[PDB]
Amino acid sequence: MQQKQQIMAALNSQTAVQFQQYAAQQYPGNYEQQQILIRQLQEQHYQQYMQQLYQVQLAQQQAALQKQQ
């Protein structure tokens, strides 16, 4: 089963107030637009999260292989 969206829900809670403070600096007074902005910030963060996981995958592979060091 595709568990991708669970990660987005977790990241939502983790970055909620973090991105809210930034969104308020960009769209002050517009709560609606602040929410739209945060939504996109989380999606772009998801791309970074996926790139990070690719490196983590390789880190775990080399830890099991030990054909270096």
UniProtKB/Swiss-Prot annotation:
Expression tissues: Ubiquitous, with highest expression in testis and ovary.
Location of region: Q domain: 2-69
Entry function: Involved in the maintenance of Golgi structure by interacting with giantin, affecting protein transport between the endoplasmic reticulum and Golgi. Involved in hormone-induced steroid biosynthesis in testicular Leydig cells. Recruits PI4KB to the Golgi apparatus membrane; enhances the enzyme activity of PI4KB activity via its membrane recruitment thereby increasing the local concentration of the substrate in the vicinity of the kinase.
Effect annotated for changing residue 4 to A: No effect on PI4KB- and TBC1D22B-binding
Subunit and partners: Homodimer. Interacts with the C-terminal cytoplasmic domain of giantin/GOLGB1. Interacts with PBR and PKA regulatory subunit RI-alpha. Does not interact with PKA regulatory subunit RI-beta nor PKA regulatory subunit RII-alpha. Interacts (via Q domain) with PI4KB (via N-terminus). Interacts (via Q domain) with TBC1D22A and TBC1D22B; interactions with PI4KB and with TBC1D22A and TBC1D22B are mutually exclusive. Interacts with C10ORF76 and RAB11B.
Phenotype upon changing residue 46 to A: Differential loss of PI4KB- and TBC1D22B-binding, with PI4KB-binding being much more affected than TBC1D22B-binding
Subcellular location field: Golgi apparatus membrane; Mitochondrion
Parent-record interval covered: 241 to 308 of 528
Effect of residue 36 to A: No effect on PI4KB- and TBC1D22B-binding
Superkingdom of source: Eukaryota
Effect of residue 22 to A: No effect on PI4KB- and TBC1D22B-binding
Protein's UniProt name: Golgi resident protein GCP60
